[PDB]
Design a protein around this ligand. Sequence first.
Ligand SMILES: C[C@H](CCC(=O)O)[C@H]1CC[C@H]2[C@@H]3[C@H](O)C[C@@H]4C[C@H](O)CC[C@]4(C)[C@H]3C[C@H](O)[C@]12C
Ligand SMILES: C[C@H](CCC(=O)O)[C@H]1CC[C@H]2[C@@H]3[C@H](O)C[C@@H]4C[C@H](O)CC[C@]4(C)[C@H]3C[C@H](O)[C@]12C
Ligand SMILES: C[C@H](CCC(=O)O)[C@H]1CC[C@H]2[C@@H]3[C@H](O)C[C@@H]4C[C@H](O)CC[C@]4(C)[C@H]3C[C@H](O)[C@]12C
Ligand SMILES: C[C@H](CCC(=O)O)[C@H]1CC[C@H]2[C@@H]3[C@H](O)C[C@@H]4C[C@H](O)CC[C@]4(C)[C@H]3C[C@H](O)[C@]12C
Ligand SMILES: C[C@H](CCC(=O)O)[C@H]1CC[C@H]2[C@@H]3[C@H](O)C[C@@H]4C[C@H](O)CC[C@]4(C)[C@H]3C[C@H](O)[C@]12C
Ligand SMILES: C[C@H](CCC(=O)O)[C@H]1CC[C@H]2[C@@H]3[C@H](O)C[C@@H]4C[C@H](O)CC[C@]4(C)[C@H]3C[C@H](O)[C@]12C
Ligand SMILES: C[C@H](CCC(=O)O)[C@H]1CC[C@H]2[C@@H]3[C@H](O)C[C@@H]4C[C@H](O)CC[C@]4(C)[C@H]3C[C@H](O)[C@]12C
Ligand SMILES: C[C@H](CCC(=O)O)[C@H]1CC[C@H]2[C@@H]3[C@H](O)C[C@@H]4C[C@H](O)CC[C@]4(C)[C@H]3C[C@H](O)[C@]12C
Ligand SMILES: C[C@H](CCC(=O)O)[C@H]1CC[C@H]2[C@@H]3[C@H](O)C[C@@H]4C[C@H](O)CC[C@]4(C)[C@H]3C[C@H](O)[C@]12C
Ligand SMILES: C[C@H](CCC(=O)O)[C@H]1CC[C@H]2[C@@H]3[C@H](O)C[C@@H]4C[C@H](O)CC[C@]4(C)[C@H]3C[C@H](O)[C@]12C
Ligand SMILES: C[C@H](CCC(=O)O)[C@H]1CC[C@H]2[C@@H]3[C@H](O)C[C@@H]4C[C@H](O)CC[C@]4(C)[C@H]3C[C@H](O)[C@]12C
Ligand SMILES: C[C@H](CCC(=O)O)[C@H]1CC[C@H]2[C@@H]3[C@H](O)C[C@@H]4C[C@H](O)CC[C@]4(C)[C@H]3C[C@H](O)[C@]12C
Ligand SMILES: C[C@H](CCC(=O)O)[C@H]1CC[C@H]2[C@@H]3[C@H](O)C[C@@H]4C[C@H](O)CC[C@]4(C)[C@H]3C[C@H](O)[C@]12C
Lengths: 13, 13, 13, 13, 13, 13, 13, 13, 13, 13, 13, 13, 13
Amino acid sequence: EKNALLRYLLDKD
Amino acid sequence: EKNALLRYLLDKD
Amino acid sequence: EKNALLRYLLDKD
Amino acid sequence: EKNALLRYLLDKD
Amino acid sequence: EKNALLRYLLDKD
Amino acid sequence: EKNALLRYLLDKD
Amino acid sequence: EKNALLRYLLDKD
Amino acid sequence: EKNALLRYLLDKD
Amino acid sequence: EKNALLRYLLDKD
Amino acid sequence: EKNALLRYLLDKD
Amino acid sequence: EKNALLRYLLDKD
Amino acid sequence: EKNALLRYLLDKD
Amino acid sequence: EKNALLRYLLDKD
Ligand SMILES: C[C@H](CCC(=O)O)[C@H]1CC[C@H]2[C@@H]3[C@H](O)C[C@@H]4C[C@H](O)CC[C@]4(C)[C@H]3C[C@H](O)[C@]12C
Ligand SMILES: C[C@H](CCC(=O)O)[C@H]1CC[C@H]2[C@@H]3[C@H](O)C[C@@H]4C[C@H](O)CC[C@]4(C)[C@H]3C[C@H](O)[C@]12C
Ligand SMILES: C[C@H](CCC(=O)O)[C@H]1CC[C@H]2[C@@H]3[C@H](O)C[C@@H]4C[C@H](O)CC[C@]4(C)[C@H]3C[C@H](O)[C@]12C
Ligand SMILES: C[C@H](CCC(=O)O)[C@H]1CC[C@H]2[C@@H]3[C@H](O)C[C@@H]4C[C@H](O)CC[C@]4(C)[C@H]3C[C@H](O)[C@]12C
Ligand SMILES: C[C@H](CCC(=O)O)[C@H]1CC[C@H]2[C@@H]3[C@H](O)C[C@@H]4C[C@H](O)CC[C@]4(C)[C@H]3C[C@H](O)[C@]12C
Ligand SMILES: C[C@H](CCC(=O)O)[C@H]1CC[C@H]2[C@@H]3[C@H](O)C[C@@H]4C[C@H](O)CC[C@]4(C)[C@H]3C[C@H](O)[C@]12C
Ligand SMILES: C[C@H](CCC(=O)O)[C@H]1CC[C@H]2[C@@H]3[C@H](O)C[C@@H]4C[C@H](O)CC[C@]4(C)[C@H]3C[C@H](O)[C@]12C
Ligand SMILES: C[C@H](CCC(=O)O)[C@H]1CC[C@H]2[C@@H]3[C@H](O)C[C@@H]4C[C@H](O)CC[C@]4(C)[C@H]3C[C@H](O)[C@]12C
Ligand SMILES: C[C@H](CCC(=O)O)[C@H]1CC[C@H]2[C@@H]3[C@H](O)C[C@@H]4C[C@H](O)CC[C@]4(C)[C@H]3C[C@H](O)[C@]12C
Ligand SMILES: C[C@H](CCC(=O)O)[C@H]1CC[C@H]2[C@@H]3[C@H](O)C[C@@H]4C[C@H](O)CC[C@]4(C)[C@H]3C[C@H](O)[C@]12C
Ligand SMILES: C[C@H](CCC(=O)O)[C@H]1CC[C@H]2[C@@H]3[C@H](O)C[C@@H]4C[C@H](O)CC[C@]4(C)[C@H]3C[C@H](O)[C@]12C
Ligand SMILES: C[C@H](CCC(=O)O)[C@H]1CC[C@H]2[C@@H]3[C@H](O)C[C@@H]4C[C@H](O)CC[C@]4(C)[C@H]3C[C@H](O)[C@]12C
Ligand SMILES: C[C@H](CCC(=O)O)[C@H]1CC[C@H]2[C@@H]3[C@H](O)C[C@@H]4C[C@H](O)CC[C@]4(C)[C@H]3C[C@H](O)[C@]12C
């Protein structure tokens, strides 16, 4: 779940 | 480390 | 609705 | 989980 | 220098 | 790990 | 000019 | 035209 | 260092 | 056909 | 500069 | 066979 | 232009 959230947040970067 | 990166990214939120 | 609020809050991040 | 994440983000609010 | 590049890239997240 | 994060972020670049 | 090219390449990142 | 060729070549960068 | 970063980013171009 | 050949030749670049 | 960058990118091509 | 010879000749292109 | 770019790309070939 942490990777999923990170994936969402880093999408743009 | 993931929590640390998340804490940085969520800081403004 | 929880997703809708999360999406707004995570906006800046 | 969604509630747990919301509780964190809403903590300053 | 790595932190500076990371900072730049993470700016929108 | 800094290189690992960078490698991920630079991947579509 | 190097910064200008870098800015272009990194803008997706 | 040079910019158009550059954009094509840089598109995966 | 700018050249080093450019070389990496341009390597598949 | 010229674009097809160009794509082939460029698609290392 | 555009030719120099193009020569670099087309180097493999 | 023509494609095979072409692939070889175009390999450095 | 397409012939000129092709001649350049093929000149090793
Ligand atoms: C979640 C994301 C993409 C995963 C994928 O979909 O393939 C991956 C790519 C690079 C990863 C990061 C890098 O591996 C560097 C760090 C390694 C540590 O073990 C965790 C935090 C750490 C900062 C990682 C967080 C997360 O797992 C990342 C950001
Ligand atoms: C990293 C952050 C703050 C931790 C701290 O400052 O001590 C904590 C507080 C709320 C946490 C999240 C919430 O507990 C809900 C999720 C629980 C899952 O087990 C991991 C992802 C999950 C999405 C967590 C990611 C991260 O651990 C968070 C974001
Ligand atoms: C709401 C947001 C964006 C949805 C979208 O716009 O498509 C999505 C993207 C990543 C999601 C999170 C990630 O999937 C990781 C967690 C997964 C759990 O099932 C719920 C909490 C959890 C922390 C999710 C909460 C929310 O659904 C998120 C934050
Ligand atoms: C998670 C937080 C605190 C829970 C607690 O610790 O008591 C609770 C208090 C108010 C809640 C919100 C409010 O009840 C209003 C909405 C009600 C909907 O059923 C879900 C989203 C909704 C937006 C809720 C999301 C979340 O469950 C909240 C934000
Ligand atoms: C560069 C950035 C901001 C530093 C600041 O200006 O305060 C900092 C804040 C969160 C940091 C990350 C977190 O500390 C978690 C990881 C810790 C490892 O030691 C390196 C990678 C790692 C993924 C870090 C990379 C980088 O230094 C980050 C992204
Ligand atoms: C991590 C990435 C890929 C390395 C690899 O192929 O595994 C490498 C390629 C070029 C590197 C960068 C360049 O060498 C230029 C900078 C050199 C400094 O010493 C660190 C930051 C600096 C910005 C480097 C960060 C990172 O190590 C990079 C981005
Ligand atoms: C060009 C870009 C954005 C500048 C801007 O938009 O204002 C800036 C932001 C982060 C910079 C990088 C970081 O400062 C880390 C490195 C610092 C070294 O002095 C040069 C290479 C180096 C890798 C820098 C190259 C470039 O100037 C970057 C990539
Ligand atoms: C063609 C490309 C994308 C333009 C766009 O559509 O935004 C642009 C973005 C950055 C540009 C480069 C940078 O501006 C730095 C140089 C500026 C000089 O005046 C020309 C060559 C030069 C090396 C440029 C070549 C080309 O115009 C580039 C690569
Ligand atoms: C770093 C890379 C490879 C250098 C090498 O290893 O020989 C070189 C090849 C061609 C170079 C570019 C071309 O010379 C065109 C531009 C010349 C300007 O003075 C700097 C930016 C400029 C856009 C250069 C950036 C960088 O130095 C490049 C991209
Ligand atoms: C064939 C290739 C990729 C087309 C595609 O699938 O997107 C395209 C992308 C950029 C194109 C070039 C650019 O548009 C610049 C030139 C435009 C002229 O009208 C034809 C020659 C010209 C030099 C083009 C040749 C060819 O059509 C190119 C090289
Ligand atoms: C830079 C490179 C080599 C020049 C040299 O050998 O030193 C030259 C050879 C063929 C050139 C291309 C061909 O002349 C066809 C195009 C002509 C247009 O006027 C500019 C873009 C255009 C797509 C040119 C871009 C660049 O000047 C090229 C790619
Ligand atoms: C043989 C080579 C690669 C095929 C492959 O993917 O393995 C292919 C890629 C581009 C092809 C060429 C392009 O499709 C353009 C021309 C199309 C005509 O139908 C045949 C000659 C023609 C000049 C082709 C000859 C040959 O089949 C090429 C050169
Ligand atoms: C430009 C180059 C050299 C022309 C010359 O200066 O002699 C010529 C030699 C063979 C030509 C190719 C061959 O005639 C086969 C193809 C014929 C199609 O009508 C155009 C694309 C086609 C793939 C041609 C593209 C280009 O005009 C080529 C590659």
